Design a protein around this ligand. Structure first.
Ligand SMILES: Nc1ncnc2c1ncn2[C@@H]1O[C@H](COP(=O)(O)OP(=O)(O)OP(=O)(O)O)[C@@H](O)[C@H]1O
Ligand SMILES: Nc1ncnc2c1ncn2[C@@H]1O[C@H](COP(=O)(O)OP(=O)(O)O)[C@@H](O)[C@H]1O
Ligand SMILES: [Mg+2]
Lengths: 460, 85, 55, 118, 85, 458
């Protein structure tokens, strides 16, 4: 039995009157017949007199005043678990591929409290990615938030597929990818490239397209985060990809403006800092398991002080910068080792060997970038026999940052390598201590670990 | 398809919204001004052969179709960081 | 003596032109921080005038 | 309306307008009292409609021609400002007079790098 | 007493204040934002022994009580000149 | 007789029988648990509702409390009975001493003196401070404003002016603490008591600790005492600890009073509220008030309405710059922005006037060169431009001075400098008499003799 009736429709904002003893709680989901399809409405406010105020999770066109409204007494509930893997869903958890119904076992409500103080883990542990640059220069924590700052052309999605593959195969985890305001063309491309790579079984995809009403694009992040909270409970460690954390912020600005709350500085919603915290505090390491997140970041004017960056940066643990200048060298992954950072890179967390190695590489590559100015302005004659040695080592360090990915094999034609944290430390510490000084610099490119560079040099 | 001055479409929709007394956003554009252009431009697409076959009830089989859009925007002083741009 | 002075001038120019490039770089970062404030304020100031005009 | 009467007779007429900006600014004064909510830099929401409805009558038909010269006030010489920025689309030749040149006393002060014609 | 990010306390109070529709001042903080921080810190003080004797009802004599405070503020781009700083 | 009907922050609405409605600015009274709260009437709404501001904490007020109508405004003790004692906005004693031996109480709301009453005076008042009486000298009976951002030196400068002026002056003085630090009230009280000068000073304090209503009215309590001593025919010194806080406490209540926001969200009444306070601080044919006011500048924005309105009120204005203070030049006075009505050849005479305009011209020209110097460096300048810079830098250093109240910071002993030594000193630098000394010789030296003795040891 439906118990409400629609009383206003002003764009996406729909007001419904209920009997006074039956008013929906906040975030409860309603549904109505918009002709020949059911339309879901999410409750935002209880106004006086039994009137409730809602955002339509679909097209508002064709709604009349006086339509009957069914009060589903829960929030939006989505399917979770193994049945989700390799499937594309919308924010409502309905399949957007053609591939039939999802064989769900449970449905979880998308609105949840973060883990309490007693449930949080009592340790800080690195998530070994197997990728030399990241594991050395920008180490991820379990439960960390990571920002990706690169543009386009820079290998951004291939890096995502490699992380998905290693966490599924070299660990025993799973991934969720949340397309917050995707381009429908790019969502189609990405789905086929994950099929062609064969990582598609490993990851579940929730996509919120741009053509969707603002409520869909706001809430889709929470659906993806809810599927990750299922996998975590099973005891796994999980990756959550957010395809643009900036668009989550803007969707909150659009919704609150449609609700007509008073705007804030630079015109953002007044709830901006809480809406970021509501998402980011669920992504943590719990005694049962952890969710780690990789988030694409956009800077509204290259202005780093603008409230959206300034709020987001407070939650990031690590920052990974991809640059086309390095991709011009054919070095892949195209990660800038000097602008990428990680707060985990401290002696008390990674230990002194790792810290000294990464500080060493940082100091050598900084110095080489200075001597490249002298080599240009004055030439190699100017350069001392000690300065020639740091140049000769920095070129070897720079190439040993390259690595062949299992997902890139169709480009490189060479089988992928996974490198353990101890091996990458030992390799870069090696080159810095001046053993392996005598190998060709091309012995280090795309090779893998240092034990394979001595095999390459024997035949190169 | 070429849409000339989509910035003029956004100005028209602002006028409609403010006369209808709907809450203003940045630069007085309504809250759903992104939803105006995004749902327009996402219609420009290339569609696969099985969509065309299904839509035409099989009278066309081997062909994809496409709509290509060239929207135009006018910046005021090279300020690409204005809201509609 | 003329030729060794001419070597001194081209060297003294490079050193001084190097400093200018650095000093110019400092001036650019300073000015950009000023602009990013002016931008954010002009957005917030006019939006308050608009919202307070719904009365 | 007087110029349209002479045009419809079939005459060729000149129309001079001493400032078009002040037509728009007079709309802004009443617009708040007419209960409209405001937009942009305080301008009425109807600014482009009011400008277009006036400018689209000043045209040369098959019966007769109207040639017109309009002065346009540019607030603080900011050619960004919505009132001058909107009128630029309705003209055929646009001459931009700049205070930067006028400061040197070199009248007519027409900027060649900004002035243009169809 | 350490208060960590009195900058975040101001942001929280601004949320509550704007949801209550209170006219914003400089930036978007309410005019009340000075009174918010001032009444908090001004409690930090050293009080003379005559006050401690009066408060304790004479049970403690000749001792001066104290409360030092270390508030933390965060500046964008090292800009010391912003409103809340 | 009245009933409370709303409580919104500092604002309380009270209903009265329609035959009995209180006048504007009447004091009302209500029992709030175990204490008495005064309310001051701001507006008459319709229907016998009246809207009021609480002179104390409004927490714990219920609706429906009975309110007593006092037939008069807020009235405070005045005269010699107040000298030497600390009093509250309500005119209550706040030191632990007994009751105030008042003979008379005056309402804090008053009209300014008529145009016929005002008096002119051109008697230059000397200060210890090289930059102030060189660049922005001021008269007995005039108004001085110290403008600056947070932490630039407004209080330390006012404490030197108190030390220098208010102890060679012989009459009474009033110090009004308005929305400033309580520690600094206590620190001031003691050194007045330790110096036994306290018995010439009346002190009123309404610090930041207090609720809005107190910070709003306490300035008027301070003026009302100073107006009693002036009308008695005395010459009085009034010091106001931060005038900006009066306007800010207006901003805090204005929205609750139901007034549309203006400008940068200020109350629409900002210029009238400031003007009605400021016009009372005037010397008169009966007697004189000399006034020094600190003026906080929010976000260092000197173009903000609250600073901008204050500038027209004052006769001398001294503007303090964070950019100078971060050099460690103190007092951090900007001489290209500081100005006075008294810098006029007729009152100062020509030597002073010419010296001040010379200093102003060299320092302006140094600002014009600084954008060249920043990109090119100095070596590109002309040999006369290099001499302008070499002098200007010495001038900037010689404007620095040790203060007796600042000894706790720099350790170095303070200096008092006669006006003649300042003119002679700066005239010599601009003439080049000292072009052979290093810049360090001029920093923090009291007089030009002390620069040459410092130069001997570099
Ligand atoms: N003449 C001076 N000599 C040495 N130090 C000074 C001088 N003037 C100011 N300072 C330094 O600046 C500090 C603050 O000065 P002061 O308290 O007068 O600032 P203010 O303008 O009153 O700031 P606020 O607005 O916070 O009250 C002093 O404690 C001292 O450290
Ligand atoms: N390990 C690798 N070996 C060879 N090429 C690589 C590797 N990783 C990335 N690339 C390059 O990445 C390029 C495509 O970047 P991609 O990630 O598809 O861009 P987008 O940001 O559009 O996803 C290809 O030209 C490919 O050669
Ligand atoms: Mg002070």
């Amino acid at each position: 039995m439906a118990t409400g009736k629609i009383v206003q429709v002003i764009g996406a904002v729909v007001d419904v009157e209920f009997p006074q003893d039956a008013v929906p709680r906040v975030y409860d989901a309603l549904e109505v017949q918009n002709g020949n399809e059911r339309l879901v409405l999410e409750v935002q406010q209880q106004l006086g007199g039994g009137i409730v105020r809602t955002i339509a999770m679909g097209s508002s066109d064709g709604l009349r005043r006086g339509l009957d409204v069914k009060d589903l007494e829960h929030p939006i509930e989505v399917p979770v678990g193994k049945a989700t893997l390799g499937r594309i869903m919308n924010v409502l958890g309905e399949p957007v591929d053609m591939k039939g119904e999802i064989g769900e076992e449970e449905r979880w409500a998308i609105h949840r409290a973060a883990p309490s103080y007693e449930e949080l883990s009592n340790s800080q542990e690195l998530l070994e990615t197997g990728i030399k640059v990241i594991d050395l220069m920008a180490p991820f924590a379990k439960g960390g938030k990571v920002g990706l700052f690169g543009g386009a052309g820079v290998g951004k999605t291939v890096n995502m597929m490699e992380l998905i593959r290693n966490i599924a195969i070299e660990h025993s985890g799973y991934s969720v990818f949340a397309g917050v305001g995707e381009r429908t063309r790019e969502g189609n491309d990405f789905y086929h490239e994950m099929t062609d790579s064969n990582v598609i079984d490993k990851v579940s995809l929730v996509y919120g397209q741009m053509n969707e009403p603002p409520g869909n694009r706001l809430r889709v992040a929470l659906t993806g985060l809810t599927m990750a909270e299922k996998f975590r409970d099973e005891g796994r460690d999980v990756l959550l990809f957010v395809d643009n954390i900036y668009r989550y912020t803007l969707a909150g600005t659009e919704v609150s403006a449609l609700l007509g709350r008073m705007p804030s500085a630079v015109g953002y919603q007044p709830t901006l800092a809480e809406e970021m915290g509501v998402l980011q505090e669920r992504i943590t390491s719990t005694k049962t398991g952890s969710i780690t997140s990789v988030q694409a970041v956009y800077v509204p004017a290259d202005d780093l002080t603008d409230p959206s960056p300034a709020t987001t940066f407070a939650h990031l643990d690590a920052t990974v910068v991809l640059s086309r200048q390095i991709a011009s060298l054919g070095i892949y992954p195209a990660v800038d080792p000097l602008d990428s950072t990680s707060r985990q890179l401290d002696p008390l967390v990674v230990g002194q060997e790792h810290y000294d190695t990464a500080r060493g590489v940082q100091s050598i590559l900084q110095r080489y970038q200075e001597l490249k100015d002298i080599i240009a302005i004055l030439g190699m004659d100017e350069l001392s026999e000690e300065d020639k040695l740091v140049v000769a080592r920095a070129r070897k360090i720079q190439r040993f940052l390259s690595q062949p990915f299992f997902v890139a094999e169709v480009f490189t034609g060479s089988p992928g390598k996974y490198v353990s944290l101890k091996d990458t430390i030992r390799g870069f510490k090696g080159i810095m201590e001046g053993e392996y000084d005598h190998l060709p610099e091309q012995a280090f490119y795309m090779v893998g670990s240092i034990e394979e560079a001595v095999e390459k040099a024997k035949k190169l | 398809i070429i849409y000339d001055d989509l910035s003029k479409q956004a100005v028209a929709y602002r006028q409609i919204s403010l006369l209808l007394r709907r809450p203003p956003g940045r630069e007085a554009f309504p809250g759903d001004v992104f939803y105006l252009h995004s749902r327009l431009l996402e219609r420009a697409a290339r569609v696969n052969a099985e969509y065309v076959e299904a839509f035409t009830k099989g009278e066309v089989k081997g062909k994809t179709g496409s709509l290509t859009a060239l929207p135009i925007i006018e910046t005021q002083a090279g300020d690409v960081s204005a809201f509609v741009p | 003596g003329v030729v060794e002075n001419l070597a001194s001038e081209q060297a003294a120019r490079m050193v001084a032109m190097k400093a200018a490039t650095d000093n110019g770089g400092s001036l650019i970062k300073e000015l950009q921080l000023v602009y990013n404030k002016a931008r954010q304020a002009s957005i917030t100031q006019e939006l308050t005038e608009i919202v307070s005009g719904a009365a």
